[PDB]
Amino acid sequence: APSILSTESSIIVIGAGTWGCSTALHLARRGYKDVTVLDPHPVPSPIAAGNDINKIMEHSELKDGSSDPRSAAFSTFTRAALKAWKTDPVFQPYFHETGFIISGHTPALIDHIRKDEVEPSETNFVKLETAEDFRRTMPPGVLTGDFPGWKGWLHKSGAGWIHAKKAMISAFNEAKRLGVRFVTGSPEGNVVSLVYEDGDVVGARTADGRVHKAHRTILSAGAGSDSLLDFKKQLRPTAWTLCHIQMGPEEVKQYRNLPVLFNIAKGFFMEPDEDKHELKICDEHPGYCNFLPDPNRPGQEKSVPFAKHQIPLEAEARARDFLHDTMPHLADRPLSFARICWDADTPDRAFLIDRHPEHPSLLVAVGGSGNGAMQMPTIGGFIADALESKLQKEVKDIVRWRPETAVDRDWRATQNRFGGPDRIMDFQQVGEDQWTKIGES
Ligand SMILES: Cc1cc2nc3c(=O)[nH]c(=O)nc-3n(C[C@H](O)[C@H](O)[C@H](O)COP(=O)(O)OP(=O)(O)OC[C@H]3O[C@@H](n4cnc5c(N)ncnc54)[C@H](O)[C@@H]3O)c2cc1C
């Protein structure tokens, strides 16, 4: 069916985000001379989930008998990612191997962590039983709370945080230096449709009415991808919430080299950024969707993203609850920034990276499922491998096109997340006056 693939083949990548920039870089390194990346926004896109001052990176090797094929595939992805965060000149400056603490504050949450995360892992964890145990994982003055009911485990090596925003910019800069062409801005990079001829994809149409033709088209537009192809319910666009506190110029100096602290039913925080000294808190919960009528499925819903630099008041309150337990000296500080951030979950929260069975010139690379950002250095290599029909066996069948898994999908499934109301929430039920008002009157 499709044209024969070579490095002279014209390629279009839809979406210059986390995975799109990685893909552009890897295709350039592999000697693909004719690559064009389309995005409605210039890098770093304000709607990219990767456009964040930090994200968590973690890699765990799994014991024999404690893996299933899905978790083994995940460890294959993170193994490669870890190696590259420590080595690849484009990414290495942006990885901080400070460690990672996973915790919960009820016996049920703590048991879940023990069974799913700790017992299966070859990692040698340090157990944290008391408030003092938690506080001693960071410099004096940083963790001050009583951690009521908390127990957790510290993973020192092979985990930490990444400066996702700077690493994405780094990848973009290097892909463009190596000759990739970026068309970024609206309407010129805002893709509204895939373009088909003879039952295959021949490129993309942007909002200005231009048709961009290529021999292969890669769809890597994060949550926005769901509007450009019928994924047969394989994607659920879903939002999480983040806010920032501005640290002062003396107090900030203690907050350095910090392991990530994560309570699976409350949230996490990462150390203040180097440029604005802003400390980011994510309140953990199963996610917000924005459920509107599915234009192609009568009587059914489909979640549609929208951008906003505020968060619901209830999400701010959850963030402050996390701070009260951990850093109560910060819990009443004004927010300096907040936003909603969109990803898309597959039914099993494995990635979806495959050639389309009906349209072989289309490659989809979607379904970050809440753990795509840590894949940045290497995900473009896996995506390029799939383009070249050689995605490795340890991942190919896990991340395949799999519409059978999403028949009668329950959009309100909590998909192994916890916190907040312990249910999927709907932005259509959030009042207009129910948001933070940062920077307003
Ligand atoms: C709050 C939050 C915290 C997270 N924490 C972590 C973490 O700690 N570690 C981790 O690994 N992952 C984390 N994730 C998940 C991670 O951010 C995502 O899985 C990953 O960034 C997704 O990458 P992507 O390239 O698929 O999407 P994105 O990075 O969102 O990029 C998508 C791009 O597509 C572009 N686009 C959209 N519409 C179109 C269109 N019509 N035409 C062309 N281009 C388009 C966008 O402008 C954007 O640049 C988190 C996500 C959220 C929301």
Side-chain angles (χ1 to χ4, degrees):
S3 75
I4 310 290
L5 183 72
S6 81
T7 44
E8 290 69 56
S9 300
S10 60
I11 301 167
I12 280 157
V13 173
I14 306 167
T18 314
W19 294 3
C21 290
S22 184
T23 298
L25 175 69
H26 280 262
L27 288 173
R29 288 176 168 170
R30 285 179 193 210
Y32 290 82
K33 294 299 200 162
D34 187 359
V35 180
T36 300
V37 188
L38 303 171
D39 202 294
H41 304 281
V43 173
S45 172
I47 72 175
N51 185 355
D52 201 328
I53 50 166
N54 39 57
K55 301 284 199 196
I56 303 171
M57 163 66 210
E58 188 194 15
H59 171 56
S60 303
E61 293 296 344
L62 295 176
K63 299 168 163 137
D64 296 332
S66 306
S67 77
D68 59 23
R70 181 172 64 73
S71 68
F74 190 71
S75 285
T76 301
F77 284 117
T78 58
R79 192 183 301 111
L82 178 61
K83 175 172 185 202
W85 278 119
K86 289 191 294 194
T87 288
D88 186 328
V90 166
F91 299 99
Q92 182 269 354
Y94 303 108
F95 174 53
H96 303 283
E97 191 173 1
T98 59
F100 172 68
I101 298 163
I102 188 164
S103 61
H105 61 288
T106 72
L109 289 166
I110 295 157
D111 277 19
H112 176 71
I113 297 165
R114 175 189 288 108
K115 291 194 245 151
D116 279 33
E117 317 292 336
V118 173
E119 272 166 5
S121 181
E122 299 269 21
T123 294
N124 299 290
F125 296 89
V126 176
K127 178 73 189 283
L128 312 171
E129 299 271 4
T130 66
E132 181 154 287
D133 289 340
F134 278 92
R135 294 192 299 267
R136 287 182 167 187
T137 66
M138 296 188 195
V142 177
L143 300 180
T144 60
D146 287 334
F147 295 78
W150 288 51
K151 298 197 182 285
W153 292 262
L154 167 66
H155 174 174
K156 262 175 266 224
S157 294
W161 65 265
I162 53 155
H163 200 308
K165 179 178 188 171
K166 284 181 184 189
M168 178 171 57
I169 291 171
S170 180
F172 158 77
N173 283 343
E174 179 72 353
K176 169 165 194 183
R177 187 182 76 103
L178 296 179
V180 174
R181 171 152 147 269
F182 284 89
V183 178
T184 63
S186 295
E188 64 272 8
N190 184 18
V191 174
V192 301
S193 186
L194 300 179
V195 182
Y196 294 90
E197 283 173 17
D198 290 338
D200 204 0
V201 173
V202 304
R205 184 192 178 110
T206 45
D208 55 0
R210 301 204 175 148
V211 174
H212 309 264
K213 299 265 198 113
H215 286 117
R216 298 291 191 279
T217 299
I218 301 176
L219 177 52
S220 56
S225 303
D226 196 43
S227 73
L228 295 178
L229 177 76
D230 186 1
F231 276 94
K232 303 299 189 198
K233 305 183 185 182
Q234 294 177 87
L235 297 181
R236 183 186 68 190
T238 315
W240 286 273
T241 40
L242 70 87
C243 61
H244 291 189
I245 294 176
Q246 171 71 75
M247 304 303 283
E250 294 292 5
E251 66 174 356
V252 76
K253 301 187 181 163
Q254 287 299 97
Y255 291 79
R256 286 166 178 175
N257 210 31
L258 300 184
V260 177
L261 173 67
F262 178 37
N263 174 322
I264 66 169
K266 289 197 181 278
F268 57 88
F269 88 98
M270 275 164 283
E271 75 185 75
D273 82 285
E274 63 207 311
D275 295 317
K276 299 192 180 187
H277 296 162
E278 277 181 330
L279 186 153
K280 186 184 88 180
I281 305 102
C282 282
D283 60 300
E284 181 66 331
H285 52 75
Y288 291 94
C289 297
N290 182 46
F291 287 126
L292 293 168
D294 189 325
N296 297 286
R297 299 187 179 75
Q300 301 189 43
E301 306 169 297
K302 189 164 182 190
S303 184
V304 184
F306 63 94
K308 197 158 175 86
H309 284 195
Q310 301 299 345
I311 62 180
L313 291 172
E314 72 223 320
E316 172 187 19
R318 289 184 299 254
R320 293 189 187 284
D321 175 73
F322 171 90
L323 291 172
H324 201 274
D325 276 16
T326 58
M327 295 187 295
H329 57 291
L330 299 182
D332 290 319
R333 294 274 279 269
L335 302 184
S336 65
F337 182 69
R339 81 180 184 96
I340 66 179
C341 168
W342 290 90
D343 205 345
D345 288 319
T346 59
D348 63 0
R349 289 184 59 205
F351 310 146
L352 170 53
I353 298 167
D354 202 2
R355 308 167 53 112
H356 194 299
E358 318 303 322
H359 326 291
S361 306
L362 174 70
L363 178 70
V364 301
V366 297
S369 294
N371 42 54
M374 73 181 76
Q375 314 303 335
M376 196 190 296
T378 39
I379 197 76
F382 292 103
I383 293 159
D385 282 353
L387 188 72
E388 296 173 357
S389 295
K390 56 192 220 188
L391 185 56
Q392 66 188 93
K393 67 193 194 281
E394 293 81 8
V395 311
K396 176 184 195 304
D397 291 315
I398 296 307
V399 301
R400 73 182 167 82
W401 186 257
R402 55 197 191 273
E404 70 280 2
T405 66
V407 175
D408 305 325
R409 184 156 179 178
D410 180 7
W411 298 117
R412 291 179 175 71
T414 53
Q415 300 201 232
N416 198 35
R417 299 189 177 89
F418 301 88
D422 281 310
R423 71 186 186 262
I424 293 288
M425 294 297 277
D426 182 6
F427 282 130
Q428 292 291 307
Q429 297 177 321
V430 180
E432 281 155 75
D433 60 355
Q434 180 63 16
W435 294 81
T436 56
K437 292 157 188 89
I438 299 157
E440 291 184 9
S441 302

